[PDB]
Enzyme design. Structure first.
Site, PDB file in Angstrom:
ATOM      1  N   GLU A 181       0.808  -1.176   0.000  1.00  0.00           N
ATOM      2  CA  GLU A 181       0.000   0.000   0.000  1.00  0.00           C
ATOM      3  C   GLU A 181       0.860   1.253   0.000  1.00  0.00           C
ATOM      4  O   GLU A 181       1.924   1.251   0.517  1.00  0.00           O
ATOM      5  CB  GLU A 181      -0.881  -0.013   1.229  1.00  0.00           C
ATOM      6  CG  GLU A 181      -1.951   1.002   1.241  1.00  0.00           C
ATOM      7  CD  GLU A 181      -2.957   0.741   2.277  1.00  0.00           C
ATOM      8  OE1 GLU A 181      -3.831  -0.045   2.043  1.00  0.00           O
ATOM      9  OE2 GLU A 181      -2.879   1.307   3.338  1.00  0.00           O
ATOM     10  N   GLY A 212      -7.690  -5.539  -0.226  1.00  0.00           N
ATOM     11  CA  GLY A 212      -7.098  -6.824   0.053  1.00  0.00           C
ATOM     12  C   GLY A 212      -7.905  -7.926  -0.576  1.00  0.00           C
ATOM     13  O   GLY A 212      -8.537  -7.701  -1.582  1.00  0.00           O
ATOM     14  N   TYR A 264       8.084  -2.417  11.035  1.00  0.00           N
ATOM     15  CA  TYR A 264       6.848  -3.031  10.663  1.00  0.00           C
ATOM     16  C   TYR A 264       5.636  -2.147  10.957  1.00  0.00           C
ATOM     17  O   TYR A 264       5.460  -1.651  12.038  1.00  0.00           O
ATOM     18  CB  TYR A 264       6.709  -4.383  11.359  1.00  0.00           C
ATOM     19  CG  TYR A 264       5.382  -5.037  11.175  1.00  0.00           C
ATOM     20  CD1 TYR A 264       5.105  -5.783  10.074  1.00  0.00           C
ATOM     21  CD2 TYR A 264       4.408  -4.883  12.108  1.00  0.00           C
ATOM     22  CE1 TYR A 264       3.909  -6.373   9.914  1.00  0.00           C
ATOM     23  CE2 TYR A 264       3.214  -5.451  11.970  1.00  0.00           C
ATOM     24  CZ  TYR A 264       2.961  -6.202  10.874  1.00  0.00           C
ATOM     25  OH  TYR A 264       1.757  -6.733  10.759  1.00  0.00           O
ATOM     26  N   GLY A 287       0.674  -9.968  10.194  1.00  0.00           N
ATOM     27  CA  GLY A 287      -0.454  -9.683  11.035  1.00  0.00           C
ATOM     28  C   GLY A 287      -1.764  -9.806  10.308  1.00  0.00           C
ATOM     29  O   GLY A 287      -1.799 -10.069   9.145  1.00  0.00           O
ATOM     30  N   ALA A 288      -2.850  -9.643  11.040  1.00  0.00           N
ATOM     31  CA  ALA A 288      -4.194  -9.697  10.496  1.00  0.00           C
ATOM     32  C   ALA A 288      -5.138  -8.719  11.148  1.00  0.00           C
ATOM     33  O   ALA A 288      -5.019  -8.415  12.298  1.00  0.00           O
ATOM     34  CB  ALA A 288      -4.719 -11.037  10.626  1.00  0.00           C
ATOM     35  N   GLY A 289      -6.083  -8.210  10.384  1.00  0.00           N
ATOM     36  CA  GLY A 289      -7.165  -7.426  10.926  1.00  0.00           C
ATOM     37  C   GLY A 289      -8.130  -8.268  11.720  1.00  0.00           C
ATOM     38  O   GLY A 289      -8.497  -9.337  11.336  1.00  0.00           O
ATOM     39  N   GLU A 307      -7.294 -16.421  11.851  1.00  0.00           N
ATOM     40  CA  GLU A 307      -6.365 -15.339  11.850  1.00  0.00           C
ATOM     41  C   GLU A 307      -4.928 -15.822  11.828  1.00  0.00           C
ATOM     42  O   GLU A 307      -4.110 -15.206  11.208  1.00  0.00           O
ATOM     43  CB  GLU A 307      -6.614 -14.424  13.018  1.00  0.00           C
ATOM     44  CG  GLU A 307      -7.954 -13.761  13.035  1.00  0.00           C
ATOM     45  CD  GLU A 307      -8.116 -12.734  11.979  1.00  0.00           C
ATOM     46  OE1 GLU A 307      -7.777 -11.591  12.240  1.00  0.00           O
ATOM     47  OE2 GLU A 307      -8.585 -13.053  10.896  1.00  0.00           O
TER      48      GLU A 307
END
Ligand SMILES: O=C(O)/C(=C/C1CC1)Oc1cccc(C(=O)O)c1O
Length: 418
Positions: free
Chosen positions: A238, A256, A353, A387-389, A399
């Site tokens: 992004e 995504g 990160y 990572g994950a939302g 996740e």
């Protein structure tokens, strides 16, 4: 001459990465390589350095380190120092920590002393690699001779990659997820992104890994660096911000994941993000300049929107970056709360990160790419982070799997140290 013809059969990423490895080692210098819009810019050698830490600002020039205390906004502090470098040279390069974006939410007190926020430098030499040509800026014979030697030699063959296991959960990502879900259900915040680190148990060759990965990734921007004891590489998914010389500011949040266009979960989340960016950009924009120009268009295929504005005279690029930082994509909704939670539920500080890698110009230009899908080496430690939302319906096992998928952008392409 300034210009060299690009050699036939040679990918630009491969050549620039080779220049980055070979030429810099030769002249004992640090570097950052940045890919933006078909140009690979190698900023070689630290001419002057700006280090912005939580408790101090350092400018190191000519071997003299000049230390200052600073207050207020980190962007204003960084902007002033970077502006000075840019009087002297055309472009500046660096990285900005996740931690850079916590002051706006008044979370700075949480940071330990000497927490890095940003490192921005002006290069001794620049080499720009594209499909057609190689352009040299401020290159001495030493650099010039080195480029020349490499160009003749050609690029190294990339060795076979070495695998790593991502199945362990030492940081307890799954349990941490659950906690987030409870907080969401309790209405503390809508969304948070939580992540886990994976140690790589062998040293990697950063330029060679960057080449192998680049072959199998098509990113919004990319980077490879050796700066101040840190090695890193990444494929940025992004763009946080692009500010032009003319004052046009852009941010492009991506969704995504046919069924991308129709799926509700994505649409709600993308729309919420679009609203957030628009609101943030508006604070720094000339009134009535903010618009969403390509809403929920399909752009791997992604859903994304382009938010645009005109930078108000009262504000500047760093302010625009601070307004948009950190990206929602790696933080949360609402942002202040998501960030707050990250201090509590994730391993902090994040550092690189979920921060950005930056290219700035004397003309007022800014390009900032969100750091995800990246590898890091500091000290004796090599690691990856994904990572994950997390939202109310999120499941800890699912996740975890998501993280594994993201890790797979890099996990097959790790080239061991040579
Ligand atoms: O949510 C996604 O699929 C996502 C969307 C980007 C915008 C296109 O990518 C990510 C989001 C959050 C964390 C990570 C990560 O690697 O750590 C990540 O890659």
């Amino acid at each position: 001459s300034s210009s060299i013809p690009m050699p036939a059969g040679v990918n630009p990423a491969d050549l620039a990465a080779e220049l980055a490895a070979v030429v810099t080692e030769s002249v004992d210098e640090d570097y950052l390589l940045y890919e933006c819009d078909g140009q690979w810019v190698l900023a070689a050698g630290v001419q002057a350095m700006v280090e912005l830490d939580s408790d101090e600002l350092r400018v190191i020039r000519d071997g003299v380190t000049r230390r200052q205390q600073w207050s207020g906004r980190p962007g204003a502090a960084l902007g002033e120092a970077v502006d000075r470098l840019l009087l002297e040279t055309d472009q500046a390069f660096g990285w900005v920590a996740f931690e850079f974006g916590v002051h706006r939410y008044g979370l700075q007190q949480r940071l330990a002393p000497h927490t890095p926020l940003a490192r921005v430098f002006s290069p001794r030499t620049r080499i720009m690699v594209s499909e057609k040509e190689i352009r040299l800026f401020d290159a001495g014979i030493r650099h010039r001779e080195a480029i020349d030697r490499l160009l003749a030699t050609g690029v190294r063959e990339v060795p076979q990659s070495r695998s790593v296991d991502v199945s362990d959960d030492p940081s307890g990502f799954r349990r941490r997820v659950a906690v987030a879900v409870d907080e969401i259900a309790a209405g503390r915040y809508h969304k948070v992104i939580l992540s886990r680190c994976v140690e790589v148990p062998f040293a990697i060759d950063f330029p060679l890994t960057y080449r192998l990965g680049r072959r199998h990734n098509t990113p919004v921007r990319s980077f490879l660096l050796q700066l101040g004891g840190i090695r890193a590489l990444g494929y940025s998914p992004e763009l946080v911000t692009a500010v032009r010389a003319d004052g046009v500011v852009i941010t492009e949040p991506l969704a995504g994941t046919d069924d991308l266009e129709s799926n509700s979960k994505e649409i709600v989340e993308h729309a919420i993000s679009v609203r957030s960016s628009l609101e943030e950009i508006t604070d720094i924009a000339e009134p009535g300049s903010a618009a969403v120009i390509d809403f929920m268009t399909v752009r791997v295929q992604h859903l994304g929107s382009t938010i645009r504005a005109r930078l108000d005279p009262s504000s500047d690029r760093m302010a625009a970056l601070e307004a948009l930082f950190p990206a929602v994509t790696a933080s949360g909704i609402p942002k202040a709360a998501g960030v707050e939670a990250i201090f509590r539920l994730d391993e902090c500080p994040r550092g690189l990160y979920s921060g950005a890698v930056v290219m700035l110009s004397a003309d007022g230009g800014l390009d900032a790419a969100l750091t995800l899908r990246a590898a890091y080496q500091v000290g004796g430690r090599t690691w990856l982070r994904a990572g994950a939302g997390i939202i109310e319906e999120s499941e800890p096992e699912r996740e975890f799997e998501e993280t594994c998928e993201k890790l797979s952008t890099l996990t097959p392409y790790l080239v061991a140290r040579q």
